[PDB]
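Field log, afternoon session.

UNIT: design team B
ACTIVITY: writing a sequence onto a fixed backbone
BACKBONE:
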């Protein structure tokens, strides 16, 4: 998240 996927892509 926040980057784990893409700038929080996950938590985005």
């Amino acid at each position: 998240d926040k980057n784990g996927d893409g700038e929080v892509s996950f938590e985005e």
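LOG NOTE: The CA atoms of residues 1 and 9 lie 6 Å apart.
NEXT ACTIVITY: expression trials, pending approval
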